[PDB]
Every structure is written in C-alpha cells, then in structure tokens.
Amino acid sequence: GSSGSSGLNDELLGKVVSVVSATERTEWYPALVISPSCNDDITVKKDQCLVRSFIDSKFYSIARKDIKEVDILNLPESELSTKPGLQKASIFLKTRVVPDNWKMDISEILESGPSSG
C-alpha cells in the first residue's frame, strides 16, 4: 500500500485551519485549504486562498491572513459531538480521509482493497 502520488505536500495546506471572520474576529470556522485546480472562474486574490469548509463543504475564498493554525483534533468531544464544521474537520484529522462528497484524491484510492482480492 503506497501507490506513489505526491499531491503537493504542505503543512498548512491540505490540513484543517481556522478562518477568522472579518465581520467578527471572534467567529471562526474550519476550512481545508486548497488550490484552484478544477475551478477556473474562482478568482483567488494574491492575498487570498481557496479553502474547503467542513460545514456545508462549500468553496470559499478567504485571506491567509485570516487563517491560523487550529486544534480541531484537540477539541473536546462536546464541541465535535456538536459543532459540525469541527467534527467533520476533526474526523479528517483522525481518519485523514475526506468524504466521498469531497473526492479530494484518496476517497477513490480506497477501492475494494489494494487491487482486487
């Protein structure tokens, strides 16, 4: 089980992050940073980056200056058990595998085992 496939390795990107609201520095939501590969029209400012929400799973364009490391997998079961954007996010921090609803580039790699059998 290896299947060489380097999908741009990063520390901040490809991981869950907390987005700080511009209308409320307090309010923050989880989002899986990503790059506009498929989406073209999606114009990402120079000080902006594409992310993947863990609530509705929508594509938002925030500023990296609004993002900041977070501990979703460190959150209490109370927050996760409740907060969705967190839970899912956390799940991806434990299961390290987004839902088929995302289909990043692993959910498919799953398949029926390594290669039939």
From Swiss-Prot:
Signal peptide: none annotated. It is found in: Nucleus. Transmembrane segments: none annotated. Identified in mSin3A corepressor complexes together with SIN3A, SIN3B, RBBP4, RBBP7, SAP30, BRMS1, HDAC1 and HDAC2. Interacts with BRMS1. Interacts with RB1. Interacts with ARID4B. Interacts with AR. DNA-binding protein which modulates activity of several transcription factors including RB1 (retinoblastoma-associated protein) and AR (androgen receptor). May function as part of an mSin3A repressor complex. Has no intrinsic transcriptional activity. Plays a role in the regulation of epigenetic modifications at the PWS/AS imprinting center near the SNRPN promoter, where it might function as part of a complex with RB1 and ARID4B. The function of the Tudor-knot domain, also named chromodomain-like, is uncertain. One study suggests that it mediates binding to lysine-methylated histone tails, with strongest affinity for H4K20me3 and H3K36me3. However, another study failed to find any interaction between this domain and histone H4K20me3 peptide. This is AT-rich interactive domain-containing protein 4A. It comes from Homo sapiens. The gene is ARID4A. The chain holds residues 170 to 273 of 1257 of the full protein.
